[PDB]
């Protein structure tokens, strides 16, 4: 019988291409539209992953949908950091095999400072020597990191799943012989890193919401997957119905 961690490895989405077109100039509009398509492709993968994620099907369907919509940018950003760490040792932002950002591309995107904040997370992966198992568990914790302020359908089911994944991370870190003598300190660094995702993700979402609302005027394209997510989520955000959960705040 596979452990949850073994299942997480099996269900982890494969890396996809962005469809970067070298025949078009690296204008901000072209780069952002490409990123938005890549995010749409990856969000379809996230939905398929969530279907087979241990424990998730035990939450009401409406809560599963809510949680994906409340965490999508965090999930995608955390995966971006992992790819950047694994494939470039965090020298570059590895969006896809056909879309790798250096500083020039960060400027060309019109999102330099946001990209720099993402790069800082990937540098923390190097500092920590984050493992794949830590990454997969942490990604589930990000799915469970932001909730409506006016309630999920099942508080009980959500708390059970979140508690279970916190315990998975704690057990993995504190039982690993590589961490002996320092494992609780490592656990707290990992949970502080999770908390820091809220800061970055809020900033990413604010800019994405801006270009979404001004999409036609700015000539920034969005795929239907993102139109669905953002059209559902933005009224909830504007209403104030968002509670980021922190380990240390
Ligand atoms: C939609 C989206 N997804 N990801 C993650 C991804 F890996 F690139 C694709 O799945 C990002 C992203 C980009 C750069 C980062 F450093 C970190 C995260 C964005 C993103 C953030 C802000 C945006 C826009 C996109 N689009 C816009 O039009 C203006 O605002």
UniProtKB/Swiss-Prot annotation:
Effect the entry attributes to changing residue 83 to A: Reduces aldosterone binding and transcription transactivation
Tissue localization of expression: Ubiquitous. Highly expressed in distal tubules, convoluted tubules and cortical collecting duct in kidney, and in sweat glands. Detected at lower levels in cardiomyocytes, in epidermis and in colon enterocytes.
Binding sites annotated in the UniProt record for progesterone: 36, 42, 83, 211
Result of altering residue 218 to A: Reduces transcription transactivation
UniProt effect for mutating residue 51 to E: Loss of coactivator binding
Residues covered by the NR LBD domain: 1-230
Positions annotated to bind aldosterone: 36, 42, 83, 211
Effect after changing residue 42 to A: Reduces aldosterone binding and transcription transactivation
Substitution effect: residue 220 to A: Reduces aldosterone binding and abolishes transcription transactivation
UniProt-annotated binding residues for 21-hydroxyprogesterone: 36, 42, 83, 211
Transmembrane domains' residue ranges: none
Effect caused by changing residue 33 to Q: Strong decrease of transcription transactivation
The record's account of how the chain is modified after translation: Phosphorylated.
Result when mutating residue 48 to E: Decreased coactivator binding
Subunit annotation: Heteromultimeric cytoplasmic complex with HSP90, HSP70, and FKBP4, in the absence of ligand. After ligand binding, it translocates to the nucleus and binds to DNA as a homodimer and as a heterodimer with NR3C1. May interact with HSD11B2 in the absence of ligand. Binds the coactivators NCOA1, NCOA2, TIF1 and NRIP1.
Disorder association: Pseudohypoaldosteronism 1, autosomal dominant: A salt wasting disease resulting from target organ unresponsiveness to mineralocorticoids. PHA1A is a mild form characterized by target organ defects confined to kidney. Patients may present with neonatal renal salt wasting with hyperkalaemic acidosis despite high aldosterone levels. These patients improve with age and usually become asymptomatic without treatment.
Role played: Receptor for both mineralocorticoids (MC) such as aldosterone and glucocorticoids (GC) such as corticosterone or cortisol. Binds to mineralocorticoid response elements (MRE) and transactivates target genes. The effect of MC is to increase ion and water transport and thus raise extracellular fluid volume and blood pressure and lower potassium levels.
Protein family membership: Belongs to the nuclear hormone receptor family. NR3 subfamily.
Domain note: Composed of three domains: a modulating N-terminal domain, a DNA-binding domain and a C-terminal ligand-binding domain.
Descriptive protein name: Mineralocorticoid receptor
């Amino acid at each position: 019988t596979p452990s949850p961690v073994m299942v997480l490895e099996n269900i982890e989405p494969e890396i996809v291409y962005a469809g970067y077109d070298s025949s078009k100039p690296d204008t901000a509009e072209n780069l952002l539209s490409t990123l938005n398509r890549l995010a749409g492709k990856q969000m379809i993968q996230v939905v398929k992953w969530a279907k087979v994620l241990p424990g998730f099907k035990n939450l009401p369907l409406e809560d599963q949908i809510t949680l994906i919509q409340y965490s999508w940018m965090s999930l995608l950003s955390f995966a971006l950091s992992w790819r950047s760490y694994k494939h470039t040792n965090s020298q570059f932002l590895y969006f896809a095999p056909d879309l790798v950002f250096n500083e020039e591309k960060m400027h060309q995107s019109a999102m330099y400072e946001l990209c720099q904040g993402m790069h800082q997370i990937s540098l923390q992966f190097v500092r920590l020597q984050l493992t794949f198992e830590e990454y997969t568990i942490m990604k589930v914790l990000l799915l469970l990191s932001t909730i409506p302020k006016d309630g999920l359908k099942s508080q009980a089911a959500f708390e059970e799943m979140r508690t279970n994944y916190i315990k998975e991370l704690r057990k993995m870190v504190t039982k690993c012989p590589n961490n002996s003598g320092q494992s609780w300190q490592r656990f707290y660094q990992l949970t502080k890193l999770l908390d820091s995702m809220h800061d970055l993700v809020s900033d990413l979402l604010e800019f994405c919401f801006y270009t979404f609302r001004e999409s036609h005027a700015l000539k920034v394209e969005f795929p239907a997957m993102l139109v669905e997510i953002i059209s559902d989520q933005l009224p909830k955000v504007e209403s104030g119905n968002v509670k980021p959960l922190y380990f240390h705040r």
